[PDB]
Amino acid sequence: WPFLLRFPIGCFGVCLGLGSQAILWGALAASPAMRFLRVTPMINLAVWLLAAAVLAATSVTYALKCVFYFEAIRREFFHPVRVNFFFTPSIAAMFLAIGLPRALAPADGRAMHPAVWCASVAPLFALELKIYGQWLSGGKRRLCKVANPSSHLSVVGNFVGAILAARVGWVEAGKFLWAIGVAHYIVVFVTLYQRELHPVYSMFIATPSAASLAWAAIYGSFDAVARTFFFMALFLYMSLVVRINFFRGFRFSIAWWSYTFPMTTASLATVKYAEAVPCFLSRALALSLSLMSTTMVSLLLVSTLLHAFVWRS
Amino acid sequence: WPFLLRFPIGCFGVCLGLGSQAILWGALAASPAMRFLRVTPMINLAVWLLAAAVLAATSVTYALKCVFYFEAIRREFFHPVRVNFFFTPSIAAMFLAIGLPRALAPADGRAMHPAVWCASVAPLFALELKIYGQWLSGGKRRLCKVANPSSHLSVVGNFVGAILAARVGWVEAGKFLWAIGVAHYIVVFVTLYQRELHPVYSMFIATPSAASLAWAAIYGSFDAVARTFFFMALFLYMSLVVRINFFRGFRFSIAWWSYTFPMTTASLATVKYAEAVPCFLSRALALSLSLMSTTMVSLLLVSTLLHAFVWRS
Amino acid sequence: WPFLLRFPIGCFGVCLGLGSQAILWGALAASPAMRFLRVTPMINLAVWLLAAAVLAATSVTYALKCVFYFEAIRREFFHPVRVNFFFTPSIAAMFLAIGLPRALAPADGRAMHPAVWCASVAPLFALELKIYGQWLSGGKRRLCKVANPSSHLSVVGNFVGAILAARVGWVEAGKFLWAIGVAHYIVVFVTLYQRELHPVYSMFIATPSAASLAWAAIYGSFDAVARTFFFMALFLYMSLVVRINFFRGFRFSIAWWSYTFPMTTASLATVKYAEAVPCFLSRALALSLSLMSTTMVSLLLVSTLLHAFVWRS
Numbered sequence: 001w002p003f004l005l006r007f008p009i010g011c012f013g014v015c016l017g018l019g020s021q022a023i024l025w026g027a028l029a030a031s032p033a034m035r036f037l038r039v040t041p042m043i044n045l046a047v048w049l050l051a052a053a054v055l056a057a058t059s060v061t062y063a064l065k066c067v068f069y070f071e072a073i074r075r076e077f078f079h080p081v082r083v084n085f086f087f088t089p090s091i092a093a094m095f096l097a098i099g100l101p102r103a104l105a106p107a108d109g110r111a112m113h114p115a116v117w118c119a120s121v122a123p124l125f126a127l128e129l130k131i132y133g134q135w136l137s138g139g140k141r142r143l144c145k146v147a148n149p150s151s152h153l154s155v156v157g158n159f160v161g162a163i164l165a166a167r168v169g170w171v172e173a174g175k176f177l178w179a180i181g182v183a184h185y186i187v188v189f190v191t192l193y194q195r196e197l198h199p200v201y202s203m204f205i206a207t208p209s210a211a212s213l214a215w216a217a218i219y220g221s222f223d224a225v226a227r228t229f230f231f232m233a234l235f236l237y238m239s240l241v242v243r244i245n246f247f248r249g250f251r252f253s254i255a256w257w258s259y260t261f262p263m264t265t266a267s268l269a270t271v272k273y274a275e276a277v278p279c280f281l282s283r284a285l286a287l288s289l290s291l292m293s294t295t296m297v298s299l300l301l302v303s304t305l306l307h308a309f310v311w312r313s
Numbered sequence: 314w315p316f317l318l319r320f321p322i323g324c325f326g327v328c329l330g331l332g333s334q335a336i337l338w339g340a341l342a343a344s345p346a347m348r349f350l351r352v353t354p355m356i357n358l359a360v361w362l363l364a365a366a367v368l369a370a371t372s373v374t375y376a377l378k379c380v381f382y383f384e385a386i387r388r389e390f391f392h393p394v395r396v397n398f399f400f401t402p403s404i405a406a407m408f409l410a411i412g413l414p415r416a417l418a419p420a421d422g423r424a425m426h427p428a429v430w431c432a433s434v435a436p437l438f439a440l441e442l443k444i445y446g447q448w449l450s451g452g453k454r455r456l457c458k459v460a461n462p463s464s465h466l467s468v469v470g471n472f473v474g475a476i477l478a479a480r481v482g483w484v485e486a487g488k489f490l491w492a493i494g495v496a497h498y499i500v501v502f503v504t505l506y507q508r509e510l511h512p513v514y515s516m517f518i519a520t521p522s523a524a525s526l527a528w529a530a531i532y533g534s535f536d537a538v539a540r541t542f543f544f545m546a547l548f549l550y551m552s553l554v555v556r557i558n559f560f561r562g563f564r565f566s567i568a569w570w571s572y573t574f575p576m577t578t579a580s581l582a583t584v585k586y587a588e589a590v591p592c593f594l595s596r597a598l599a600l601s602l603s604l605m606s607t608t609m610v611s612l613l614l615v616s617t618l619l620h621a622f623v624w625r626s
Numbered sequence: 627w628p629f630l631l632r633f634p635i636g637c638f639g640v641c642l643g644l645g646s647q648a649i650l651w652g653a654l655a656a657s658p659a660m661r662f663l664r665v666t667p668m669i670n671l672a673v674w675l676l677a678a679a680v681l682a683a684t685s686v687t688y689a690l691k692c693v694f695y696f697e698a699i700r701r702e703f704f705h706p707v708r709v710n711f712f713f714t715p716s717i718a719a720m721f722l723a724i725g726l727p728r729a730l731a732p733a734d735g736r737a738m739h740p741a742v743w744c745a746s747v748a749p750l751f752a753l754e755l756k757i758y759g760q761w762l763s764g765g766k767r768r769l770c771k772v773a774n775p776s777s778h779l780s781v782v783g784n785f786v787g788a789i790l791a792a793r794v795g796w797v798e799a800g801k802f803l804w805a806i807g808v809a810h811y812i813v814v815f816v817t818l819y820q821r822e823l824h825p826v827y828s829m830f831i832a833t834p835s836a837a838s839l840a841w842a843a844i845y846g847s848f849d850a851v852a853r854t855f856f857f858m859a860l861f862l863y864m865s866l867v868v869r870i871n872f873f874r875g876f877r878f879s880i881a882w883w884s885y886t887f888p889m890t891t892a893s894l895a896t897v898k899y900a901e902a903v904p905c906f907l908s909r910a911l912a913l914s915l916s917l918m919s920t921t922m923v924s925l926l927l928v929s930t931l932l933h934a935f936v937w938r939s
């Protein structure tokens with residue numbers, strides 16, 4: 001089949017930015033600050049089922065491509081941009097584990113047995129152990145020659161793994177992942193300021209919002225480090241809507257689907273903050289960012305399921 | 314008038330380093346550690362009135378230059394060194410707001426109504442949103458080609474705004490400004506170590522002392538992060554008196570007036586520290602740095618008001 | 627004597643990595659987590675006496691070389707690699723002060739009179755004030771042209787001095803040294819990621835483990851910053867055994883003696899952690915790293931005292 005050679009690894013962004021929506025809707029349904037919203041816990045279940053189906057689809061499709069044409073993911077893995085998209089097949093699974101619907105989780109049973117944390121973070125941790133080792137000892141694939149805004153996709157995995165580790169109960173593994181995540185977020189942040197794409201340049205917002213969420217999941221509250229990182233993420237989000245006013249052009253692509261993952265985590269951190277600092281301005285900010293990320297995911301969805309059908313119908 | 318084209322933006326340093334003295338004298342008059350000093354609260358009022366008069370003078374003079382010869386501040390704004398001096402016309406106003414004399418503040422009235430924070434930090438926050446956005450997406454004005462010791466003047470604004478926000482009561486805006494200030498202080502600090510002027514090379518001390526003061530104003534006490542930043546500032550101050558022994562030469566200029574702003578904030582942070590850790594060695598250190606910054610401001614003043622009169626008398 | 631001109635400054639690593647073993651054995655004998663180990667406090671005393679004898683030997687030998695052939699340590703000091711080994715003659719003394727045997731310390735007497743902190747950290751602090759000043763104002767010896775993995779030897783001194791300052795009682799000097807240590811560890815860490823030796827490339831582990839130990843000595847417990855730095859050090863240790871599997875080759879040298887100092891501090895931080903978080907996996911990790919660093923020091927020792935005798939016997 002000649003279709004599989006044209007199947008990209010960036011198609012996992014469609015599932016990343018769609019399973020990160022199940023988490024946001026679960027938060028909006030369970031947060032005791034957005035309780036004026038008469039939101040149902042059924043929306044989270046529907047979005048999560050859609051995300052899991054999409055993940056299974058683009059995972060079996062990619063397993064077929066990897067087992068049939070192995071020279072193709074080798075050309076896709078030795079790229080400066082498309083090597084960081086090999087973390088999304090595991091971040092998209094950690095985002096399904098974190099946002100498991102309450103109606104679907106076993107009642108009066110095991111609270112997310114930690115096997116789902118290991119089985120999902122080990123393939124990310126090994127790839128990260130290789131990439132972070134190449135960032136030093138690499139000759140041609142050193143960080144100073146590869147550093148791009150899509151390099152934040154290697155770091156986000158650590159904070160999402162910390163959230164999942166906090167969920168499963170292993171708090172110390174969460175602290176380990178958060179430490180090795182911030183230690184390299186500092187490096188990437190400083191190395192990207194020395195050295196304009198619309199969708200993928202916005203990964204500057206997904207790493208600090210995730211670092212704020214992971215610290216609030218590990219340690220119970222939003223204790224000034226979650227706040228430091230969240231306010232850094234909010235400034236990076238505010239300084240991004242200003243350059244690209246939102247009128248970049250008629251562009252709706254699979255790469256544009258990784259324009260929703262940073263906005264959704266930045267809308268989730270602010271929901272946690274609005275339930276941590278219950279003002280009116282903070283609640284309105286969380287309600288604005290949430291309805292701004294959700295509507296973009298919705299339009300991308302009704303656009304994709306349109307192009308998909310009007311291909312040859 | 315041909316005088317206005319030769320009027321520099323760096324003349325706002327004369328007001329920055331003179332309104333930062335009203336704050337130091339207010340601290341020396343109100344700190345319950347320097348109470349052996351029989352200092353009067355009238356010195357703070359006199360210095361603050363002088364600073365406000367100087368600010369009004371060099372602000373009306375600069376408004377006239379900007380509204381008459383607009384091609385001049387365009388040549389002054391597109392400079393690597395003189396673009397960071399566009400933050401001082403607002404930091405010098407925040408330093409008047411923070412150090413309002415107790416005798417002049419309305420008794421039994423509003424405690425610094427937060428309009429003075431917005432009206433004074435908005436023009437700084439917009440310019441900062443533009444500069445920090447250019448540090449990434451700029452072609453010729455990127456940070457790696459502009460980074461100089463005077464680039465710390467973009468960061469100090471955040472910490473001074475955090476102090477003012479803590480004063481007006483909006484603590485969360487203070488935390489926001491402190492977060493977006495430290496996030497870029499790390500970048501500037503690391504980018505200035507890769508790549509010797511006497512007065513302006515000393516901006517390495519004004520940013521950490523201000524970051525220590527802002528954290529102590531936001532959170533009530535001097536809780537180990539104020540201490541980390543203050544000790545970093547003290548080491549940078551100690552490692553500066555050693556290179557330039559203080560005998561750089563017979564040099565007393567308007568650029569030398571931005572040699573007092575870093576020393577004054579580093580003398581203010583140590584007053585806060587001496588009232589936080591009440592030893593003898595700490596009190597003597599605060600009393601040494603205070604009398605070392607104040608005497609330099611005094612000699613610069615009696616030198617400037619001398620050249621000013623002996624021009625043509 | 628023609629032998630002295632061939633005497634290297636890196637010979638102080640033999641004492642650094644051997645006096646850092648007295649501390650590890652004292653910890654293993656005094657930690658209330660490794661109490662299943664029937665370890666004796668006599669092993670710490672024996673190792674400390676050996677370390678002090680070696681230090682006196684290679685210090686008198688080097689004083690003779692410095693006072694006889696002064697043109698040689700000038701050629702050794704103006705090197706990019708061998709200028710950072712001028713901190714080890716003081717870190718090796720701070721490691722004797724920190725790990726003084728309990729049987730040898732005066733009972734019911736002064737608790738490490740702080741003169742041993744000043745007399746041992748002043749020669750390090752002056753050299754550090756010079757090197758850190760050159761990292762900015764240097765023309766040919768700037769950091770961007772000198773930064774190598776052995777540059778972490780300038781930073782470790784700060785954290786070891788913080789531990790010693792906490793021991794002697796001067797906690798605020800410890801906080802000062804920790805602040806000026808982390809401020810430059812961030813710089814070195816970020817500047818080494820832009821720009822493979824076996825023994826000296828492993829200094830990436832000695833600085834964060836020491837920064838974790840210093841924060842736990844200053845502030846009583848292992849409070850999440852010690853944990854952040856220790857987990858960063860543990861990841862850097864885990865990502866180092868993987869590249870060099872431990873089979874680099876038949877190499878046992880004086881430079882290989884500075885392959886034990888990072889592993890020993892990383893085995894000491896994990897002993898502190900295992901006494902802070904008393905699980906089984908953490909205790910086994912501390913017992914693994916300890917018996918992995920100690921056996922390497924032991925084999926290096928029985929190898930050195932073999933080559934030394936079989937030279938000409």
Ligand SMILES: CCCCCCCCCCCC(=O)OC[C@H](COP(=O)(O)OCC[N+](C)(C)C)OC(=O)CCCCCCCCCCC
Nearest residue numbers: 118121122125169170171172173176860903905906907908
């Ligand atoms: C083993 C080689 C790797 C070394 C790094 C280990 C991480 C820190 C060790 C501390 C041990 C400890 O004591 O804590 C770790 C915890 C047990 O503690 P807890 O139940 O969470 O504490 C109590 C908190 N309650 C009360 C809330 C429950 O179990 C673990 O998560 C095991 C970690 C598995 C490996 C994690 C490494 C990360 C890479 C993932 C590879 C699959």
Ligand SMILES: CCCCCCCCCCCC(=O)OC[C@H](COP(=O)(O)OCC[N+](C)(C)C)OC(=O)CCCCCCCCCCC
Nearest residue numbers: 234277279280281282431434435438482483484485486489
């Ligand atoms: C709005 C778009 C900008 C997004 C960034 C907002 C900052 C954080 C929001 C948290 C809201 C909150 O809940 O706190 C913010 C506080 C209200 O809380 P508080 O009274 O201080 O808490 C109680 C503490 N007491 C008990 C001590 C009093 O009000 C504000 O300062 C409004 C902030 C105005 C905008 C600040 C943005 C900075 C740029 C300046 C532009 C003029």
Ligand SMILES: CCCCCCCCCCCC(=O)OC[C@H](COP(=O)(O)OCC[N+](C)(C)C)OC(=O)CCCCCCCCCCC
Nearest residue numbers: 547590592593594595744747748751795796797798799802
């Ligand atoms: C002097 C020019 C250098 C400026 C930097 C000074 C460091 C911070 C000053 C705070 C003073 C203070 O108040 O604390 C410092 C302490 C006294 O406090 P403490 O007993 O530990 O607190 C009580 C804690 N207990 C209750 C547990 C005991 O004494 C000192 O360690 C003096 C420091 C000597 C110089 C340190 C500079 C580092 C370079 C080393 C050069 C030899």
Ligand SMILES: CCCCCCCCCCCCC/C=C/[C@H](O)[C@H](N)CO
Nearest residue numbers: 182183186219225812815849850851854
């Ligand atoms: C780039 C190398 C250094 C990387 C690390 C930089 C920052 C490390 C510490 C940041 C996170 C620690 C925040 C402190 C939290 C408090 O101590 C409380 N214990 C929170 O529980």
Ligand SMILES: CCCCCCCCCCCCC/C=C/[C@H](O)[C@H](N)CO
Nearest residue numbers: 186189223224225228495496499532538
């Ligand atoms: C350059 C990218 C990362 C920038 C951020 C680096 C450091 C971020 C945290 C430093 C400040 C947090 C200090 C922690 C304070 C404690 O948690 C207490 N809650 C203080 O109230």
Ligand SMILES: CCCCCCCCCCCCC/C=C/[C@H](O)[C@H](N)CO
Nearest residue numbers: 499502536537538541808809812845851
């Ligand atoms: C490179 C320039 C910036 C360097 C500093 C970066 C991090 C500075 C703060 C890290 C250490 C502070 C951790 C905070 C501890 C808590 O506030 C508690 N008070 C601990 O006692």
